[model samples]
Target: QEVTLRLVSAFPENGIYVQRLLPWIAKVNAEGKGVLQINFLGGPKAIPTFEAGNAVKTGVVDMAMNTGAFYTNVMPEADFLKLTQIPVAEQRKNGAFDAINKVWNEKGNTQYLARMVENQPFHIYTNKKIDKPDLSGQKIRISPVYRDFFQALNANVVTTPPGEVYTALERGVVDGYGWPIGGIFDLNWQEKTKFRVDPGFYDAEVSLTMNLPAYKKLTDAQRNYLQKQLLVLEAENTFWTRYGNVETARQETAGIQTIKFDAATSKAFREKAYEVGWAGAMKQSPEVAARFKTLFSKAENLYFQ
Candidate 1:
């Protein structure tokens, strides 16, 4: 008998992350017909994004596609996933993947299956232009993903729901916000945004997670098949690098200026982002943070770099 797992996404169905996941689910359902299947129930409508992690841990669902930042309530170290400069494949080889999986199992009762999005990094978009990396006195929108870094930069961080960002920008409630390169147009924030600061920071953190109990219940062959499929999905994440390039160009066409910082300032800016981010992670769990720092150390000749 085939074992079918019910899955939910923390993103909306029409969003980029879920759109990418849909194809992979279809492939798995087609290829693992006799041994396994995934019944993609739906997105946030099925379970609120913030609660999806607990839902999986408590066995309300077999699996979920969610961003690490959304689940930090369950696993504080999870927010560090975005701070990784390394690619997913390297994380697997360098033991970072297993390290994260261990934490997920211990802290959240979930299995870290795959990073659904990778390579793309977050950029600072602003309606107000800045010549330097500083954001002092600027009211900026923030999520958990970049709160530490923005705070370190002296930004007057404003917490606003994603739905209200456009209005916030229009009304001057926030002068800027941090976001990954590909989603601005989708959200229509590009219309109000004027500049995208170059040399982006933080990797996209969306991931596939399975309930630990449900994962353990699968037969060895079933587990092997799922892991094999994830390798394919991981390789496919490289497509996001090109997608990011296309989106950047599209933003330029839409009249958003690309602001390139000087080499010294750019390096310092990127370093500051990771420095503050890792500091926050260390405070949450020093042992795990140190382990990840060693595991995710930057290497030369990376495809995404």
Candidate 2:
């Protein structure tokens, strides 16, 4: 039978939802031909993005395309812990969606459907006229995992809201900020932050998902067909990454002063990255480590050395 369902999103039309999910929908609907249709809606201004977890859990909408990091409030582990950061290919290789669904089942028998996914390598975008990318003596903005890393590098890492980034930059309150490069390019952040340094969280996983009840309504054939078409969605998004890469270089030539660390400094950064992100998360929620170790044990090891 044919089906049409609403996909709620919390992002503005020009943001990640429009850039990524809109294309995926067009592809899926085209692939579905006449059998399935996905109707998308922005968050009802009535309920904000942060409430998205509860909205999904309650079936307020068929499903949601949301930030997993916000799941921290639903369960505080996202605040400092490292998400498995499985690249999209790992989703296909180890059946990651199934594994996450399994974990969901353990907590509440909820189904998690992760189909369209990609990585956002986190980068530190600096405002000052610094020649080198090393963050020494700069007040950097951090979210999730970069706090300890920035401090260890002798930079003062601070927290700021995303909306406040521009003002912070303009007011000279912070010298730099961190986020996936793709966003800096697409969001016109290039105008604010003069330089973007690649930090290679290349496998920083973000995805679109639906609740179990909605997914179960689909036929096995529908599910199989979607799985086939999404590989194309994943490949096409390479354009977003390439665009970011080109623009990062463009900004450098335009005088943003690109800076990549030497292998030893980078090694130090990575050590702090893992230590603070993992140990800190465990300190906050011990069971998070226990559960993560178990889930990771079952995770397809293609990328998890």
Candidate 3:
């Protein structure tokens, strides 16, 4: 008998991150045949974005495509996943991948399956324009992903679920928000957004996670097949870098200007992002953050900056 696992996404079905996973779902259904099937129950409508992590941990769903930022309450070290300057493949090589998975299983009661998006970093999108690296007095929407860095810059932070960001922008409830490069068009936030601050920071942490109990219930063959399919998906994720470039060009044509800072401030902008990010991670769990710093380091050359 085929085992059909229910999968939920923390994003809408049409959102870029979830859209990328569609083909993998189809492939698993086709090849796994009698071994496994993934029923992709649609995004936040299926489970609220912030709550999806808890759902996965509690086995309310068999699996989920979500981000670590949403579940820092469950595993405080999770938000640090965003600070990774390298791709998932490199993390796997350097032992960071296994170390993180260990924490997820121990603290969150979920299996870290794969990082669906990587190398693509988050940027600040705004309805207002600013030339320098300051966000003083701006009411910027935040997720835990960049909350510390934004607060460090003195922006007045506002918190909202992803689905509400549009109306938040439309109603002037927020002056700007942080998000990765690819998904604003999917969310239609680009209509209100006018500028993208240059020098994006923090890797996108969109990932697949499976409920520990559900994962444990799988037969060895079923588990192996599922993991192997995800390996293929991870190998293919490099395409996101190219897709991000194309998406940036599209946003520029849609009237979103790129706000570039001077060389000195640009360096400071990038440095401040990682500095505050690491500081926040350290404050949350110094022991885990210390180990992460070692495993996540790439000699002297971090890739994404």
Runs in model 3 deviating more than 4 A are 302-305
Query: Of the candidates shown, which would achieve the greatest lDDT relative to the real structure?
Result: 3
The digit string of per-residue lDDT tens for model 1 on 1-305 reads: 68999999987676688779999999999999999999998987888877888888899999999887877778888788987878889888888999999999999999999997987899888887888888888898877888998888788887654556788988988999988988787657887899998889888888899999999999999999999998999889878989999998999899999988899999999988888888899998999999888787787633366
Q: What is each predicted model's overall lDDT from 0 to 1?
A: 0.87, 0.60, 0.88
Better of 2 and 3 by lDDT: 3
Residue by residue across 1-305, what tens digits does model 3's lDDT show?
A: 67899999988787887778899999999999999999999989889988899999899999999888988767777788888877888888888889988999999999999988987889998877887788887999988987899988888988777888899999999999999888888878988899999899888888899999899899999999999999999988879889889999999899899999989988889889988889888999999998888777666764455
- After superposition, which runs of candidate 2 have C-alpha atoms over 4 Å from their true positions? 43-47, 77-86, 105-110, 115-119, 128-142, 145-164, 167-173, 235-241, 284-305
How close to the true structure is residue 117 of candidate 1, measured as C-alpha lDDT?
91
lDDT per residue, candidate 2, 91-193, as tens digits? 4565544655665545422455553435455666776654443567889876544665566557888775444566777788888887765555454566777
Clash list (residue pairs), candidate 2: none
Candidate number with the higher lDDT (1 or 2): 1
Residues forming the 10-long window of minimal summed lDDT in candidate 2: 293-302
Q: What is the lDDT of residue 193 in candidate 2?
A: 73
Model 1: pairs clashing at backbone N, Cα or C within 3 Å: none
Root-mean-square deviation of Cα positions for candidate 2 versus the true structure, in angstroms: 4.3
| lDDT of the structure predicted as candidate 1 | 0.87
